[PDB]
Amino acid sequence: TGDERFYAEHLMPTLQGLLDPESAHRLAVRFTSLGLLPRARFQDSDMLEVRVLGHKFRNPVGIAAGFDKHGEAVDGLYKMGFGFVEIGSVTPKPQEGNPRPRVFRLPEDQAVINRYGFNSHGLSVVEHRLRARQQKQAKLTEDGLPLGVNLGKNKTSVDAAEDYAEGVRVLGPLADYLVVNVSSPNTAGLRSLQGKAELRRLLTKVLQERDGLRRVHRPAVLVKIAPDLTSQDKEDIASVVKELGIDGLIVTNTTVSRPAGLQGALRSETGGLSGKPLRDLSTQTIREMYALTQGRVPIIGVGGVSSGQDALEKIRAGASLVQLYTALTFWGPPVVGKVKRELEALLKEQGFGGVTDAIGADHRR
Ligand SMILES: Cc1cc2nc3c(=O)[nH]c(=O)nc-3n(C[C@H](O)[C@H](O)[C@H](O)COP(=O)(O)O)c2cc1C
Ligand SMILES: O=C1N=C(Nc2ccccc2C(=O)O)[SH]=C1Cc1cccc2ccccc12
Numbered sequence: 001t002g003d004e005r006f007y008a009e010h011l012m013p014t015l016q017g018l019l020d021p022e023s024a025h026r027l028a029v030r031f032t033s034l035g036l037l038p039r040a041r042f043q044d045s046d047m048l049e050v051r052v053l054g055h056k057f058r059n060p061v062g063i064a065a066g067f068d069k070h071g072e073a074v075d076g077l078y079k080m081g082f083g084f085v086e087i088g089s090v091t092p093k094p095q096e097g098n099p100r101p102r103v104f105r106l107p108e109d110q111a112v113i114n115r116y117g118f119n120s121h122g123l124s125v126v127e128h129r130l131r132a133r134q135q136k137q138a139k140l141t142e143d144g145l146p147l148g149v150n151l152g153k154n155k156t157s158v159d160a161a162e163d164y165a166e167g168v169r170v171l172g173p174l175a176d177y178l179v180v181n182v183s184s185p186n187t188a189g190l191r192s193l194q195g196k197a198e199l200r201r202l203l204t205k206v207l208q209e210r211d212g213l214r215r216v217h218r219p220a221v222l223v224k225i226a227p228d229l230t231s232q233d234k235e236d237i238a239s240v241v242k243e244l245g246i247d248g249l250i251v252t253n254t255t256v257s258r259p260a261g262l263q264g265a266l267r268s269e270t271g272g273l274s275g276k277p278l279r280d281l282s283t284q285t286i287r288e289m290y291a292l293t294q295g296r297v298p299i300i301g302v303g304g305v306s307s308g309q310d311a312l313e314k315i316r317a318g319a320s321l322v323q324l325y326t327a328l329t330f331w332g333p334p335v336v337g338k339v340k341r342e343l344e345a346l347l348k349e350q351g352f353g354g355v356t357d358a359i360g361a362d363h364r365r
């Protein structure tokens, strides 16, 4: 198709030449919130449908947290072709996040490093924003386009579980699924909430708040993990997830590692790395988690997805759904239809009736 080619080779390099990464993002969000796109040529086939988390997903490719941090562009993003949308991370109180610059292109690596630090309009602003389209969203969800909301904690917060509980109370009622994000590389001690005893205390509490909501307003709760966990960390997470009945896992966040081979000038910037260099690392974490959970805990695979093959590798490794974020910054919106079209072809090629059949297929070889 001519869009994929026009954006990849002309529009995108020209936007990159003109704007810094954060400016580029601010604008993409604005353009997307307003409707300014084509609307995806691509009609979703029934092959691409998945039932998971107590919902239907028209297609398994979503937009990952971080792009629409404050719930400003949700509708524009469904229009862009994504089959689900996740917003956030959202913190209880507004906060500016880290000082600029805080995001960086590694174009030689097809990667991004960012250290935003949970810049957020805060719960209550985001709450009103979602309330304003609540019903539009109830019909979207009924149609197979669900909404997830990803929760973070304030920098100066003295009680991390309490931040998350507040989150659950305020935005849980407006979400199909909530994410407890304990894997940001950009908030002091946040990733240590991933340790057992701390993870169990926090999630017990989150799940309690969640169960306290009214049934129609009661979201699934997932936990988003780093790709940088030790074997122990992973065993422990798996365990706690089974012990508490956590609804799913998102795998993975960005990596604080710096794989050998990175060429980008800015490769030594502090921050989490996303995009291609993260891909196989995150696919392997999906693999280890699926196995440790016996395939009974849905996983949203995320990290370096940019093609149907990328996606399908994550699905075969155990992901029920996948998300991308960095690919959109290199290739623009056509990447979304590109991934779907290829995923569909690949599924036919390997004799899968649909996505559901491919989920975990590698573990059954
Ligand atoms: C600029 C930027 C901001 C991000 N912000 C968030 C965030 O607030 N919360 C979160 O859970 N993940 C965040 N992520 C991580 C993405 O959700 C995703 O896990 C990661 O980038 C891997 O996917 P990708 O390689 O498709 O970008 C962010 C990523 C980038 C690149
Ligand atoms: O999602 C996008 N992100 C872009 N840049 C970024 C966003 C977040 C972090 C880093 C960047 C970056 O460019 O480094 S550019 C873009 C999407 C896009 C590009 C070109 C035209 C568009 C028109 C409408 C919506 C998105 C568009």
Ligand SMILES: O=C(O)c1cc(=O)[nH]c(=O)[nH]1
Pocket (backbone or CB within 6 Å): 066, 089, 114, 115, 116, 117, 118, 119, 181, 183, 184, 185, 186, 253, 254, 272
């Ligand atoms: O806000 C950020 O800096 C951020 C959060 C997160 O979860 N992941 C990430 O890569 N950056």
